Amino acid sequence: KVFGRCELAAAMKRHGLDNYRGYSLGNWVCAAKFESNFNTQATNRNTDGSTDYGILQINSRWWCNDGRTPGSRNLCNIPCSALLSSDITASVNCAKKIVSDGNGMNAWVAWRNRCKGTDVQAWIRGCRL
Numbered sequence: 001k002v003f004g005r006c007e008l009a010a011a012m013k014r015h016g017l018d019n020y021r022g023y024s025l026g027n028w029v030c031a032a033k034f035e036s037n038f039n040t041q042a043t044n045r046n047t048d049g050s051t052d053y054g055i056l057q058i059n060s061r062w063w064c065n066d067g068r069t070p071g072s073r074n075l076c077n078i079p080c081s082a083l084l085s086s087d088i089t090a091s092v093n094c095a096k097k098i099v100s101d102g103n104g105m106n107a108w109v110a111w112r113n114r115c116k117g118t119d120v121q122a123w124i125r126g127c128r129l
């Protein structure tokens with residue numbers, strides 16, 4: 001599923017991401033735009049041989065099981081394929097664990113490099129939330 005911007009903003013807010021660990025909804029929408037372009041089916045291989053899955057490009061090195069990431073963990077206790085669903089519940093639940101891990105949203109390098117410190121409220125502009 002390719003989400004619309006406000007469509008994804010509504011879904012993330014319904015699932016309790018607005019101001020989760022102090023991060024406003026536009027931070028999460030901005031992260032999703034630059035991680036996945038709002039595409040639930042996005043997959044990208046990392047140089048370490050792990051893979052990033054779904055709207056928030058959650059990494060198989062730590063968070064989900066894909067069966068092909070030697071020495072990796074599965075801290076969200078989910079198959080990485082569950083992160084590609086049109087229903088973002090699994091991605092959001094797993095994202096809440098990631099952002100709680102100590103470094104907040106710096107875990108998402110695209111958030112740090114492209115969203116952090118920017119006018120992220122622009123990403124929810126015009127949305128009926």
Ligand code: NA
Nearest residue numbers: 060064072073
């Ligand atoms: Na893994």
